[PDB]
Amino acid sequence: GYNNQFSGRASQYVAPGTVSSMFSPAAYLTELYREARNLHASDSVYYLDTRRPDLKSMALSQQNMDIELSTLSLSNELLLESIKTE
Amino acid sequence: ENANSGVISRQFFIDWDKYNKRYSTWAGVSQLVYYPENYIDPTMRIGQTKMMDALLQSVSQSQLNADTVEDAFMSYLTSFEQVANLKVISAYHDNINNDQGLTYFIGLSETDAGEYYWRSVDHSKFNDGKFAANAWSEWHKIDCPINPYKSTIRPVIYKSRLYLLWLEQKEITKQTYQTETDYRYELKLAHIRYDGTWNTPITFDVNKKISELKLEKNRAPGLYCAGYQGEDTLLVMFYNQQDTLDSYKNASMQGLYIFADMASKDMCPEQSNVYRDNSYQQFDTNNVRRVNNRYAEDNALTLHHNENGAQYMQWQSYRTRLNTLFARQLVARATTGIDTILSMETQNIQEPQLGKGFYATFVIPPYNLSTHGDERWFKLYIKHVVDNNSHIIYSGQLTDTNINITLFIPLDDVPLNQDYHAKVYMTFKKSPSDGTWWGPHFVRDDKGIVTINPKSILTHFESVNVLNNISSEPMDFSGANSLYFWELFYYTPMLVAQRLLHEQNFDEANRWLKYVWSPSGYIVHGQIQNYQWNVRPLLEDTSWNSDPLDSVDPDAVAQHDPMHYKVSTFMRTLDLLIARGDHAYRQLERDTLNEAKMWYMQALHLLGDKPYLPLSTTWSDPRLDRAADITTQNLTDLFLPQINEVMMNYWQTLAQRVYNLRHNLSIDGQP
Amino acid sequence: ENANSGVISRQFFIDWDKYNKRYSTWAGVSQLVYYPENYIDPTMRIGQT
Amino acid sequence: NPYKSTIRPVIYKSRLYLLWLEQKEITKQTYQTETDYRYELKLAHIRYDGTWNTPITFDVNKKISELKLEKNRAPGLYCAGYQGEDTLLVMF
Amino acid sequence: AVQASRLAGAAADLVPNIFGFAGGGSRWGAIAEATGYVMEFSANVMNTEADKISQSETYRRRRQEWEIQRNNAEAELKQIDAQLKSLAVRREAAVLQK
Amino acid sequence: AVQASRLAGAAADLVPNIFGFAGGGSRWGAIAEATGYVMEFSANVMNTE
DSSP states (O other), rough: HHHHHHSOSSSOOOTTTTTTTTSSHHHHHHHHHHHTTTTOOOTTTTTTTOOHHHTTTTTOOOHHHHHHOOHHHHHHHHHHHHHHHH | OOOOOHHHHHOOOOOOIIIIIHHHHHHHHHHHHHHHHHHSSSOOOOOOOHHHHHHHHHHOSOOOOOOHHHHHHHHHHHHHHHSOEEEEEEEEEESTTTSSSSEEEEEESSSSOOOOOEEEEEEOOBBTTTTOOGGOOEEEOSSSSSSSTTTTTEEEEEEEEEEEEEEEEEEEEEEEEEEEEEEEEHHHEEEEEESSSSSSEEEEOOOHHHHHHHOOTOOEEEEEEEEOOOSSSEEEEEEESSSSSSHTTTTTEEEEEETTTTTTTEEHHHHHHHHHHHHHHGGOSOOOOOOOEEOOOOOEEEEETTTTSSEEEEESEEEESOOOSSHHHHHHHHHHHHHSSHHHHTOOEEOOSSSEEEEEEEOOOOGGGGTTTTOEEEEOOOOOOOOOOOOOEEEEEEEEEEEEEEEEEEEEEEOOOOSSSSEEEESSSSSOOTTTSOOOOOOOSSSOOEETTTTSTTTTTTTEETTTTTOEEEESSSSSSHHHHHHHIIIIIHHHHHHHTTTTTTHHHHHHHHHHHHHHTOOEEEEEOOOSSSSSHHHHOOOOOOOOOOOOHHHHHHHHHHHHHHHHHHHHHHHHHHHHHHHHHHHSHHHHHHHHHHHHHHHHHHHHHHOOOOHHHHHHOOOHHHHHHHHHOOTTTTSSSSHHHHHHHHHHHHHHHHHHHHTOOOTTTTO | OOOOHHTTTHHHHHIIIIIIIIIHHHHHHHHHHOHHHHOSSSSOOOOOO | SSTTEEEEEEEEETTEEEEEEEEEEEEOOOOEEEEEEEEEEEEEHHHHTBBOOOEEEOOOHHHHHSSOTTTTTHHHOOOEEOOOSSHHHHHH | OHHHHHHHHHHHHHHOOOTTEEEEOTTHHHHHHHHHHHHHHHHHHHHHHHHHHHHHHHHHHHHHHHHHHHHHHHHHHHHHHHHHHHHHHHHHHHHOOO | OHHHHHHHHHHHHHOOOOOEEEEOOOOHHHHHHHHHHHHHHHHHHHHHO
């Protein structure tokens, strides 16, 4: 069959579209963030960690990939928590 | 305001605009690197040979029949044979030092008004004693007219552009009233243009300079061509032929200067003496033809034409085949047609050996950490009693199994030691240092039989055997002609099968695709054959490399690891079976739907058991802050590889199609 | 697991994939051998001069 | 363009080859002007597509001049392919 | 075949053809003429070949347009039968009105 | 390529080719013939394009 001829390149595959796969959009977020987190010095006001602190604590989960919430609620949640924090 | 200029210079942001800015492009690039078989299309390929481009457009039409495709293949084979029989004349080495640079070859086809082809090879890509297959370039036809005297043509590189000098000779008459004859000689220079056409040859009068050379009758003057470092001048020198370099030390060097505008000047004798005493090692004696370097102010590369017909280049222990006598042996196989050309016993046609030497088989001991160490690398080194440095001849990783390695071991022309003629020794992480007797020493007698010196110690070889009865080796799918051999044995059947699929000539497509691989097996002379795949490099490469090639071309990466080509053929067999089932299913009568079912069931057991994939695993929903550091330890460190989405799709469509055949729907699922 | 290699070498299983696997192809081959006049088309012929 | 229809096929390495003798006419000075001939054996072979390769000239003037031919007589040309060794035997 | 023929004639032409007190007569340009003839013939053969391919693609596009037409005719045929079914009812209701 | 080929043949043709008591033999028209061949070929290539 296929498996006993062409298995062996990897010890554990995963399903198409799951979060844990290296082509998932989570993997693209992580890979992009690794390079992006350094474009400015820490002290600059344009530093990403300063500009969007919650993004750095974002969980990578199937939950955050599947649930299609409204964006405007997320913009309200972000401005609101910044105001209550300040 | 100001991004960190160091961070922007990273490769990730140079590739930004092309691949990484859009998620879909990034995913496509990453799968095209990791899963080449999805994006391999036999119709178009980078680096396609000109005769395969003749083939594709010749076979591209609405109606394909057995005779049409057979004739298209016989015309392809004619082109291939013509480009394989040609022999090299001369070469030039582009760089002052032999380690780097390029080497340009000139080759003549066996025809009366000869056609001349130029080929280039790369020394940088050469390593571990074997030229990489991609280093070699395909032959290119030379368009300008060439009519040299005694095949006195010599390429040269000037200002990084290719130039050709060849000496033409013509015959003219003298009055003495008795009538008499004599010759005149015209050196001609041409060069290539950016579009690969050739500029018109410019004549240079050399009659004085040749007449100063008291040539023997029907002897070609020694012509030396070299491009000067720094000054943009072509050095062209004429020298009298001599049997030894020791004689060139005082040869009366004729020559002339040639400048970028193709003006010329003569040499002063004083300049010629200097250019001589520097370059004389490069002069081709009557016995052997040397390769020129760029001029300078550890033997040269060399071309030997062996008596058995092997042409081989030499510059160290290293020897390399240039031409292949495959096409001259193929005619017997071709007399019985296509089914015999492609067969496995064509691919084992023998190549004559190159140079003087012997064959030896080395059996590599198993992995054994106490005699091995942690690093699994090992290197085979040769040494010759010239007592130069050693040279690497093979490099590999120690397996737990043995490895059987059969090597051609060069032997020098002259036995500069009486007790042994070569030393081979085995080096590895645990014991990288060599020992005086700690490898097989080989010696040859007068009758030419090679034997292992009993004084030598074989303890860390599992076995060494000398195959004294063997004077040939298998056709080489990694040598110079590797591109043409992959062009014929594998690409051509797959291209033909692909074209026949679109024309719905399934019966002819099945046999054409069956040439490369057949699950039923192969029968020869009335006996069933053990092998399953008809192509030797697919049969021999049985598992992927420890790492792939990182390259955004699917075909070079599949060429580096031909286990991928096996999947591409498998997937084209499934494409054929599904299309045949759909075609039968299009007729809704009772009998035909049972043919549709047996076609789908046939592809079903080939695919086999659909893999089960545990829905949740070790992956733990980490913080993005953590995944960034886990991945940046210098993504597979934390993200797992997915199963090929196309192979998954074959199981989805086959199961749904059989579901309709079982439930009496149609193919669009309507009752 | 293992078919008899002698039986597979028979001509009937060499012709399998081309003619004998489908009943319609087998019937067509057998009539084309036994009744040539049906399949003789003057327009095209093998070995045409 | 053979002399006196001196053409003879031969098989070599299972491929078809043709030998034919061409003859040409050339002039000699003796200041009286005189004539004599020269002979050029030519070999061609077929390709896989049924086209014919270009004929390759072989100089036979010595070998024919050793044969004291009668005037306007075609030399006996014998062509045969050797078993084992891949050589064309060409004999006059 | 034409490439081999022109190369053979070119090579056979460079030998001299007049003898005695006058010599030579070999046309020096024959190799360049043969390369010109074969390279200008090449353009014509590529035009013929490209025209064979373009004719083939034409016949294929025409056949696909006959699928669009045949499917349109079949759909119109299929809807007429249902029109007849509706009229068969409408007639049953008119008999019932009687 | 054809333009270079025809110019090269024309230039190589003007040298004399018979010698001894008879001289010359160089066809004087070769340059005009080459300009004619390349300029009539040009029309065909523009039609193809």
